Amino acid sequence: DADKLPHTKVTLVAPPQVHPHEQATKSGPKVVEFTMTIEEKKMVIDDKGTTLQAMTFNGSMPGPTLVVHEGDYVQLTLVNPATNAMPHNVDFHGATGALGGAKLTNVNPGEQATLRFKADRSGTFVYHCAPEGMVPWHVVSGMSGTLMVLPRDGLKDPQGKPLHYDRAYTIGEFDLYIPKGPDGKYKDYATLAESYGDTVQVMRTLTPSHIVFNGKVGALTGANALTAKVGETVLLIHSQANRDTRPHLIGGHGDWVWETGKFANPPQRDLETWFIRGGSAGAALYTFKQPGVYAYLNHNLIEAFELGAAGHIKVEGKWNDDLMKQIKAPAPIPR
Amino acid sequence: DADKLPHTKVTLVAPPQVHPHEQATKSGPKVVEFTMTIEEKKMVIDDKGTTLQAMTFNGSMPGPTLVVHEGDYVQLTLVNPATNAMPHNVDFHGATGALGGAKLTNVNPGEQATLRFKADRSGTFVYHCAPEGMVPWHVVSGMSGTLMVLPRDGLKDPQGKPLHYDRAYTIGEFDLYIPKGPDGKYKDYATLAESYGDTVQVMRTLTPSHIVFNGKVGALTGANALTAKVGETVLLIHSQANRDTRPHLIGGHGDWVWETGKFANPPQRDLETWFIRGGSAGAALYTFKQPGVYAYLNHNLIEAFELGAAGHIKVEGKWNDDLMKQIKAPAPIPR
Amino acid sequence: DADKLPHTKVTLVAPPQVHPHEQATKSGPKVVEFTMTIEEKKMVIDDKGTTLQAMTFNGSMPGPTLVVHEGDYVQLTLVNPATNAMPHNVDFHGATGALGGAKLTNVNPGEQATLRFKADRSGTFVYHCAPEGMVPWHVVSGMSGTLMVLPRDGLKDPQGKPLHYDRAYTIGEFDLYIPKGPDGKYKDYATLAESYGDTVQVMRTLTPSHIVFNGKVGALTGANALTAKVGETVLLIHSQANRDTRPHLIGGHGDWVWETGKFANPPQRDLETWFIRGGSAGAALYTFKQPGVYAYLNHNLIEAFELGAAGHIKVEGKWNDDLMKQIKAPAPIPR
Ligand SMILES: [Cu+2]
Ligand SMILES: [Cu+2]
Ligand SMILES: [Cu+2]
Ligand SMILES: [Cu+2]
Ligand SMILES: [Cu+2]
Ligand SMILES: [Cu+2]
Ligand SMILES: [Zn+2]
Ligand SMILES: [Zn+2]
Ligand SMILES: [Zn+2]
C-alpha cells in the first residue's frame, strides 16, 4: 500500500510540451509527487489586444500535463499564493471520491494542500478548478489541464499490438466569454472580481466570443508552431473542460484515436475528424508521411478561423509523390 | 407469434425510479402491456417561479421508463383525456414502422389507442410525442421518455462476461425555451396554446433558457437526490430527445457505458464524460467505491450550473484512503 | 507504382444518387480519373424565396460523391471557369499532404489543375474548398461533398462477415448563415462578393438561419423523396463539413453505422440516432422491413422541422403485423 511505496518527484513543463516520461515501463507503482501554483492574471487573448481576466494552474492555459502510469498514486501539492484574490481547488476526473478532490483541496489565497489519489484507470483525464458556487467561471477563465495515466505496458491497438509515440503535445481549447460595453468594444477589467457579473451574462448566452488553443488566438502558430519530421509519431492530447470540439489535422488523419480518451478501450483508426466531449480529454496518434505545414484545428471552421481554434504543425522531410502528386499545376483552361 | 404468446401487465413508476424488472431472465417472449395517460399542465421549472406550459406522459418529465426484453412485444394503450387541449401520439425509437408508431396513435382529447410492436433490438431508446406540424414543440415541452429493451441474458461486457446493476435511475434532460416580454421577465401563459408562437421564436434561436433534469432546476437535489451505497452498481439511463448532452459523475466514472445506448454493441470503460446525442438515450453503469455526495451533470458547466442540468447522488459507506487521501489539509504556505 | 497502373474514367452523377460502382471487387488498383467544375450561383434555399449567394462543386449542394477502392489513386481535374468571381481549391480529407491538396489546386477563374493522391484509407471522407483566408465562407456557401473509399473486399461487420448495400444515397447537410436587414427580412445580394461581410457577421454568432439537406428546405421531399422497397438495404452517406449533426431514421434504425465514417473500424448496430462530427462524413446501412414514408432527419428537432434539416424516404412493400400492429385504432375513452 501507498505508505510503503517508493516516491518520485516530477518537474512539470509548460504546454504544449509534456514532461519527460516512459511509455511502457518495467517500474512498479510509485507515489508520484507534483506541485502546482495558481496564478490569476490578466492575459491578452487575440491580435487586437482584447484581455481576459484569467485564472491558471502554473501560469499557463492549459495547466501543464501530468503523466503517471496505471497503479501509481498522484500526490499533488496545490498552492494558492496570497497575491491571488479568489479561493481555488482541483477536481481530477482521473480520481475517485470527494468531487474528484475538490472537497479536500479548497485553498484560500495564502494557503496550500496536498492530495493523494490512486490513478487506477488508464487514459487522458481533465483536471479543473471547481470552487462551490463559482465552478464554470473558474473553468472558462483558464483553470484546466490534463492528467495522462498510461497503461503500465504502453498503448495498445485493437488487436493488442503495441503502439507508441515519439513526441507528445498537449493542446487545451478554451471557450471564452468576453463582455462588451455599449460601444461594442470588449471590456477591460481592472480586477478579476470586476469581470464576474458581466462574464456570467455572456456565459449564459452559450456563445463564446473567442475559442482559443493554449490561451490565445495564434498561440500555436509562427515561431510557436508544433514541430515534427516525416516518420515520427506524435501524440496530440486535446482537452476541452467546458464545451465540445472536433479536432482535425489538415492533410493528415487520426491514425489511432481514443476520442473519449480512455486507453483500456480500443482506438479507432483513420479518422478525419474526432470528437472531444466538453469535460474530457482525448488523444490521437499520427505518423507523419509528408513534410510541410499542417493545420490542427476545430472543424467547425467558424470556431477555428473566426474565433481562434487553430494551430500549425511544421513538418520536416522528403515529399512522397506516391501519396500525393501535382499532375498538372494551375494553368489556363484549354480552349 | 404474438397472438399466441402469454401477456403480462406492468405497472409504471414515476422517475427517477424504474419499475421492477429482471435483467437476465429464463422467461420466454411475452406481450408486455403498458398504459400511459397524457397530462398537459403548467409547471414551475426554476427557483424564481418561472413557468412552463408543459406536456407530459403520465404527469412527469420525463415520461416513465418502460422495461422489456429483446423479443417481447410492447403493447401500449395511449390515453389523451378530454381535459387536454392538443392532439398527441407517440413515436417509439425502439419500434419499426409507421413513424415509430406516430401514424397509428394520433389521439385527440377524449380519445385513446393501443399500439403493439416487437422490441427486436436491445438498448435504451427514446420515445416521444410527434404530432404532424407540431413535433418540436411537443418534445421540448416535456413529451419524451425511455424504453429499455434488455437482452434476454442480461448486459454483457466487451468479452461477453456478465454485467449487472443493483439499482436503476432514469434521468431526462430537457432543453427549454421560455419566452420573455419587453421587461426581460419570463412570460406566464394562461393556456398552452397561448405559449406557442412566442416559444417557436425562442426555439429558433437554438438557445435554451433553462436546461433541466426531470422537469426542474434542482429536481434531483436535496430530499430528492439519488441514493446509493459503496459496493452497489447503479445504472444511469440518460435521455435527451432534442439536444446533445455530455453526462459526467463528479468524483466517479462511467465504468461501462453505452453512450449510443445499444446493448448489442460493446461498452466503453472508464469514461470521465460520455455523450448523449440529441434524439437518443444512453446508459452507464458505475459501482460506488467512496461515500459522499456526488454531482451527476452535463459537463458544459454553464449548461449545468447556470441553466440547471445537474443533480446529486448521496452515497453511504466507508471512506477508502487507498483510492483518495487528504495528505495535508489546507493550511498557510510555509515561509 | 501509379505511373504503371491502369487508368479508368468515372462519370459523376448529381446527388442524392451516387455513380455506379462495385463494392467488393476482383479488380486491382487503378488511377481513377474524375473532373469537377466549380459553379458560383445564387440559389433559392427555402419556401419563401430566401436566396443564398452559393458556391458549388458541379452545380450541386453537396458536390457529387466520388467512389473508389482502398489502394486506388484519385486523380481529379478541378476546373474554375472564367464566369466565376472567386479563386477556389479542394481539400480532400481522404488525402495525405499539402493541406489535403488545397496547396496544389489553387485555381483562379479561367484556370484548372489536376491532383493525384493515393486513397490508402477506407471510409467516407469530406472534401471541401479551402482558399487561404476564406475557408469557412467557401464551405458554408456550399463547397463540400464526399469521397467514399471502399475496402477492396467490401464492407465488413464486427465479426468480419460481409455487409452490402443495394442502393446508395448521398445527403449533405448545410448550416447556412443568411443575413438580415433592418426590416428583419433576409438580404438578397446582387453578387457573391457583396454577401461576404454581412455573412461573416452572422457566421460569428454560430447560429444558422437555415440548416438544409442538399441545398434547400424540402430538397428530399415530395417528387424528390428518396425511394426504397422492403428487403432492400440502403446506404445513407451523410456529410457535414462545418457543424455537428445527429441523423435519425423515423420508424427505422441504423442497422450498421460507422458514425466517424471509417470502414476499417467495426460498425455499431441498432442505432436510433448517430452523430456526424462537423468536418466529417458518416455512413449507415438499413434494410427496410416496413413500407411507408419514413423521415430521415437531424434529431435536433428544431434544426430539422424549423430550420430545414429533414427529408423523406418512400418505401414500397407489404406491411408486417409482427413488427407493428394497430391493436385498437383511435376511439373514445370508455366511460
Ligand atoms: Cu479556481
Ligand atoms: Cu469536471
Ligand atoms: Cu403531444
Ligand atoms: Cu424521434
Ligand atoms: Cu471555393
Ligand atoms: Cu477540412
Ligand atoms: Zn516512432
Ligand atoms: Zn451488484
Ligand atoms: Zn441486399
Residue numbers in the entry:
A (entry chain A), B (entry chain A), C (entry chain A): 2 to 336
The authors write:
Here, we have utilized serial femtosecond rotation crystallography (SF-ROX) using 64 large blue crystals to visualize the resting state of the active site of AxNiR, one of the most well studied CuNiRs. The sub-10 fs X-ray pulse length from the SACLA X-ray free-electron laser allowed diffraction data to be collected to 1.6 Å resolution in a ‘time-frozen’ state. The SRX structure revealed the expected water ligand bound to the catalytic T2Cu centre, while the SF-ROX structure showed an unprecedented dioxygen ligand bound to the T2Cu site in the resting state of the aerobically purified as-isolated enzyme. However, there was a large patch of positive density on top of the T2Cu in the SF-ROX model adjacent to the water molecule and the two catalytic residues. The density was clearly due to a diatomic molecule that is shifted towards the linking water position from the normal binding position of NO. The modelled O2 species perfectly fits the electron density and its bond distance was refined to 1.24 Å, which is compatible with O2/superoxide (1.2–1.3 Å) but not peroxide (1.4–1.5 Å). The O2 also has full occupancy, which is unusual for ligands bound to the T2Cu site of CuNiR. In the AxNiR SF-ROX structure, the geometry of its binding mode is unique in that it is not bound directly above the T2Cu but is translated towards the two catalytic residues. Since in our experiments the short duration (less than 10 fs) of the X-ray laser pulse precludes X-ray-induced chemistry, the SF-ROX structure obtained from the blue crystals is that of the copper(II) oxidation state. In the present case, our finding of a dioxo species bound to the T2Cu ion suggests that dioxygen reacted with a reduced NiR species at an early stage in isolation of the enzyme and represents a trapped intermediate of the oxidase reaction awaiting the delivery of a second electron to enable turnover to produce H2O2.
